[PDB]
Amino acid sequence: AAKDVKFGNDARVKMLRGVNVLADAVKVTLGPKGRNVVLDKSFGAPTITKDGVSVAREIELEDKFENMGAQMVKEVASKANDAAGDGTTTATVLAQAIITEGLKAVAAGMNPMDLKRGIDKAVTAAVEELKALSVPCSDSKAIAQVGTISANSDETVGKLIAEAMDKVGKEGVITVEDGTGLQDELDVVEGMQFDRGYLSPYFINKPETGAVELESPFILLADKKISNIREMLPVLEAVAKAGKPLLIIAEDVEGEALATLVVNTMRGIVKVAAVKAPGFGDRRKAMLQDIATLTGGTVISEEIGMELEKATLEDLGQAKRVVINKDTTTIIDGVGEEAAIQGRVAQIRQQIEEATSDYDREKLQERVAKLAGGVAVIKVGAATEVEMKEKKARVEDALHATRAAVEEGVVAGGGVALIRVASKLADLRGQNEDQNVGIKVALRAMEAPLRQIVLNCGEEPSVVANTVKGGDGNYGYNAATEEYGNMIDMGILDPTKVTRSALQYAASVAGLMITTECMVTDLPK
Amino acid sequence: AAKDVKFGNDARVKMLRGVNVLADAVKVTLGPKGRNVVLDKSFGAPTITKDGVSVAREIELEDKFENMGAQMVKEVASKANDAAGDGTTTATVLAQAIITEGLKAVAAGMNPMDLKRGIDKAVTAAVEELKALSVPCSDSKAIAQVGTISANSDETVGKLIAEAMDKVGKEGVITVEDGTGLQDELDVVEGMQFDRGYLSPYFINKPETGAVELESPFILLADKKISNIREMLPVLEAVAKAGKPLLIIAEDVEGEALATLVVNTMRGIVKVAAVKAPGFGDRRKAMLQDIATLTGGTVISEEIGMELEKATLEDLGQAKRVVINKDTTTIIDGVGEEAAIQGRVAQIRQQIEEATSDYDREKLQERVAKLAGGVAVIKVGAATEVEMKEKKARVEDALHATRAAVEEGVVAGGGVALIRVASKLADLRGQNEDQNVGIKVALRAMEAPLRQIVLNCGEEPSVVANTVKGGDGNYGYNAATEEYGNMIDMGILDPTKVTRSALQYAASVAGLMITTECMVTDLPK
Amino acid sequence: AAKDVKFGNDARVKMLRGVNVLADAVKVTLGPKGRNVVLDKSFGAPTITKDGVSVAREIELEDKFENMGAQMVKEVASKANDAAGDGTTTATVLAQAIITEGLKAVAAGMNPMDLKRGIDKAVTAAVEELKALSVPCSDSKAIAQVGTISANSDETVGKLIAEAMDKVGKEGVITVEDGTGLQDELDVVEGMQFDRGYLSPYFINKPETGAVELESPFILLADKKISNIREMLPVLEAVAKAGKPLLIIAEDVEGEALATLVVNTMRGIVKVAAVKAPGFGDRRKAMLQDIATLTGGTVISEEIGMELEKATLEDLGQAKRVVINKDTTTIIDGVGEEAAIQGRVAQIRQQIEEATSDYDREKLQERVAKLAGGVAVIKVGAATEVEMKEKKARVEDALHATRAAVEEGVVAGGGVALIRVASKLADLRGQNEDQNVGIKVALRAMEAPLRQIVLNCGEEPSVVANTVKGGDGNYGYNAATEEYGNMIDMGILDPTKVTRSALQYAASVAGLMITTECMVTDLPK
């Protein structure tokens, strides 16, 4: 239909209004003293939550332009959350501060491209400063500490994360499930982990997790793109008779094919979910063969000759359980014989020995690593199902935070790491006046999270900010206890990775929006 | 239904407002320092882009008259894109400048036809002056240079374009695909390319490319029009059972058959692409025989006697991959035996020997050229799939720019070539005062692109324009570094063909536009 | 009546709109190619003028806040005019530029007081740099040159100013007159001048000059305030019988007395002008005795004993002609005997000999100087009354410019002196970022006059500004001839004093205005 176009500073102020609305809605909940926010369920009582991620997905304004601004800020914040596992609120607050200041400066006839360049310089300097200020978390003791801190100060979950961490090594895979007994159970079972996302969000059987958990699902290996529904109709009938969930790994899925699969899942006849083919080319085929070895399945490739129509239940693989995250996959306890898997590992090891190319050697090494390391299994243990659910969620978020900390490090939490890098970078200068102004905008905008936390605590924001900036190291302001001191000592910690990613994505979206004039928009009807 | 008509200068100002909206929307993104622009999306986050083609595609105004003005300018800009491969933003900016000045002069009580004649004289003089200012790009070194600078200064892609260029000669065919390994692969396989477009846009399986990529498709050769789908039923059943893509080269395809094939493609049971049969008469039949030789198919003609109902899978040809551009096609690695192709080449060579007409001789010579030259195949090589996609896009645009440069030449980029032509043609005079005023309008409107680029950079436009006009040769203003110098030395180059086509099409649409009075359109409801 | 206020940035934008209206109205007429502007006349035809003073006189806006902004700028510009004699348009343009930029910066959350301090520092540096760039005008040849160019390039009037300047010395007094013959006349008579303005603007018998010219008036010397009109009744009757004008010098004039004299001028039975008594205390009494000596009058003081009621026509002084400027007075050819004046000069000379205080010695020396030097009178000579009036106006503005140049100096005109100062002060830095931004605002605002002059000429402003900044010395851009070169050589000159005063007053009003929040005003009814 027709499209109203608004360009100039009117577009900028409308977009700023949208970002202001979304940023207020999110920043209210920031901090340990974060205030509650009430959503609206279509039916029944409204839900009340302090979670920035849950509230953020709800807001989308009425008038279209500010809706666009809010939507893209929300999308970048969600990208930040997916990258690390937290920091949606921090990213949104940083984006709001940077954008308010930057658009205020742009309204003063200042070169927006220079503002973007200065902000980029400031944020990269802040990122390397954070890396300098990072504290290693390789030792198991700090791993237990961060696990405890993430899960609302519970030592048992941090301990469990520590033993699983030891079991599956530094870059291991850890999955969480429900255990029958009150005691927590840990064991390692051979299983896969590759980074691919579901074809459609509608496959999500558990929307509150955003994942597809299947119990004893058959698996179909395909090196070919599924084009016609007739190709996998016989296996669809076979699995429907079997009355079990299905998993489809294929080179590609066409639009009509995935539409038909979505319709079938809505029918509920078969609990089938599909995911893209990982790997690439020959590497893709080799690791598909690895999956077949693991699950006892068989790869169906056009080049070899067989077709999906000639698919039997025996030809398919199987596993005890699988989970399809947003951009991750997990296979647990493949049926395939361990001796065959060890033989495949030996074959790939010989390939490593004869490997001459460096990147192919890296691919083979990580392939054998994921093939032999397996998948850690953590089973939550308590008395009541309410504590099952809440402790499972706590274990989930603690595991995310702990792996993020292990990957990069851990800095002082509560938003004071940003304050520290800002104070460290007080003399950073750009190539000219405009870049310098952008640098100063970024520097004074990185103070927004601590100021908002203090404001939620009810104390004076600027006083606490000045007191923190006066100190050096990791000295900061405990929001919960309202006492000063070394944040690491009192346990308030955030992974270096989450803060770095949140700041980087906030700066990226800020620079990407500061330099926009035109907006095409559907007519308000 | 009823149609509101508006004529006189009120129609002209309506048209000017529409063109102003579209031109602002597009020109905001012009130049290396081009400002971003956010676009519509009915669902999810809005997309952010600096490519003016998408912005133009996503523009249409609420008011009907503004909409018609914007739409005709957009159509001419799209024609400019199709001609060369770039320069939509430049064409739109030139059109906006010429339209503003010319409509202003027409409102100043001046003969519009004389303005059009003066603009045409000025633009043809500019075109020949630009051809004089062109720099040849025949040598492989300049080919590598243009390929490198086109793809954001990547030497590897320009190099690869250079080797493919050497492989398939001056007027060879270049195609891009995805390579399994990190190394780039190049090889020549007998193929084809003829200038024909898809019957409808709906065949586009990949809208972001505007093409129809099919893997291992069967081809049906037909010298007749597709009047009834009954003839298409047996082959459709055969290809549905085969479960492979289909291609249809026919003399014509009626609208009802087009609707049937559109419905079939939307169903997804069978994917099929149709395209007009090029050549003409006897030449058309001869090149269809060539296609049959290459693909191992058979030509089905009413005159010979066989009908499309009596068509088997063996009768159809086959190839490893095909792509249907907007107005072009490509066939890669025809199954047909190379000895048969060589025999056909020898037959057409004898036809060349006995050829008497110069035109028939040229047709036969280009026929043997396109038959024996084959098709170059370039496979992108890297690790990640994300970089597969981005480097494939870079290779595509670099190939387009490189072939455009080879066809005609390469001039100073950054919009300074138009400034140089303007300075060279400062004394061009028409037959009378009105033609002279039109000439001056065109001359001062050719400065719009550089002025807009400088304005996007934040510097003073007119100062830079005057400084550039002062110099001679290719001296100008580097936008990225903000340093004066020579564009040839600084690697900021644009093909002569794209600039010439953009300027010519802007002049053509401006001449058409100025000489309009009446605007018939449907009532606003 | 009730009053409404408005504070914050809304007040600033209201003031910005008002000053924008006034600045547009004034700046249109700037430069030699200044565009005309029509005025309003309640009766008869409108008057078309290029003089910015006249245009600014009638400007007052509908909205109260815009009216305040316009009135503040207009009052400061009028102060600039009174200080030097020209440069109202330059002051208004500078104020508009500085205010636009400063309020734009203040909207960016920037400390207004630091902006004021930075602007003050920048303008002080500019003033001292301008003094450094000043060219002396002491020699008679340069005096003739400035007089010639001031009066639209008429050598005769500049010559006449030169001879008068020689007659009455460097700090002499010169007064215009209408000479009967076509030949220009010059004479030296015993006169007087002191810096005092009329009590009421209503005394102005010639509003287009803003002065009070009286022929053969009877001066009355008084050392007392005119509390009651009864004291003025006998002298008023005497002068009514005499049927001649009169002058009144008194210690002070009360509101009732001046209201009564305004009534008596509206009746105009007596031609009366009253001016505040100059001098101070004993110095005032001594110089009033000097006035009595010059005019043959007598000082009437309460302390001595005589009263204003016991005043005869003989007691009053007399002179051939007097003129009361806005803030100055002139008395020409006092009737008093020259021998008595010489004796008084000698007496004050022996007072100088015994004068031990430095400032008292200065007062006595300037007193004898103004007593002995007298007033020179230049009489314009032509054939027609119309050319008499226009040449009289030319003599007025020419001698104003000449005395301004003699006082301080002469710099390059056409607004290029400010450009040169700006280029010289490109590296001036403040104490912090805010003061630096204010400094840059002032520096880029000093380019406004030349830019507006070029824009009125129809050429490109910024190109000319850049070309001028590139040069050094006095190399500017001739607006009239549109040729570059040295302003001094081509006689486009402005006094250093007028440029300095205009810039200083523009900076002062800009500082007073940027730091304004509250606007208390009467309600719009």
Swiss-Prot record, chains A, B, C:
Modified residues (N6-succinyllysine): 33, 50, 116, 276, 320, 389
Post-translation changes: Phosphorylated reversibly during heat shock.
Cell compartment(s), UniProt: Cytoplasm
Recorded consequence of changing residue 108 to C: Forms inter-ring disulfide bonds. Prevents ring separation and leads to the formation of high amounts of symmetric GroEL:GroES2 complexes
Family named by the database record: Belongs to the chaperonin (HSP60) family.
Summary of subunit composition and partner proteins: Forms a cylinder of 14 subunits composed of two heptameric rings stacked back-to-back. Interacts with the co-chaperonin GroES. Can form asymmetrical complexes, composed of one GroEL and one GroES, and symmetrical complexes, formed between one GroEL and two GroES oligomers. The asymmetrical complex is the functional unit. It was suggested that the symmetric heterooligomer may represent a transient intermediate in the chaperonin protein folding cycle.
UniProt protein name: Chaperonin GroEL
Source organism of this protein record: Escherichia coli (strain K12)
Lineage: Bacteria, Pseudomonadati, Pseudomonadota, Gammaproteobacteria, Enterobacterales
